[PDB]
Amino acid sequence: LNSAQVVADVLSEFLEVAVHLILYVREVYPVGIFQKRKKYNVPVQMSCHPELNQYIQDTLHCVKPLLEKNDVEKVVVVILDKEHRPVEKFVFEITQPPLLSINSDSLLSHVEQLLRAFILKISKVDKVLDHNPPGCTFTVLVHTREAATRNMEKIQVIKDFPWILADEQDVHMHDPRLIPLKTMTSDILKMQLYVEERA
């Protein structure tokens, strides 16, 4: 589909903005590399560190194809402690329609409004979430059907950025305290965002 390209693009920049902001609000990186920026008419924090920015973009460019052929279920930004085990998880459940309309009009400016709300919620999450333990790092998990990864092969080699199966310990969460943030729905995208904290 051609309208899938645009939903994969739009969704991709959103995820990048979200990731940059989640890294900010959860003190995963030194406050100083983050710069004030503005997307969806809202103030955000984008990083100015070369490699970090390239790491996040290389990650999203690999998801882009999975997003097109509606192969993404959950895109998760996981925060780990020195024990190298999950402390927090920002789950973005995703599902697009079986097919996308060829009557490509500006119902997208409607998506921007919906997206805008996720950004704002993420910006306040540090109010309902205690401070994480020092020295945490992040990773990105992506939930798909083992067969749709075929769409990823070519681009992994392109961006020279390989992926691999996740080990159930690398994902495992204790309990955990589910904290819902936002849930949107629409002609092209139904998305939900919630946080998983540990005890």
């Binding site: 990186y29 560190h49 279920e73 790092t137 998990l141 059907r145 067969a147």
Partner: peptide, 25 residues
């Protein structure tokens, strides 16, 4: 065919590398 969780082989730059980068103005 069935459910799977995937992630990048490469690890994000360590908070330590970033600090050195920052302190160097």
């Amino acid at each position: 065919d069935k459910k799977i969780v995937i992630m990048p082989c490469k690890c994000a730059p360590s908070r330590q590398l970033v600090q050195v980068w920052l302190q160097a103005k």
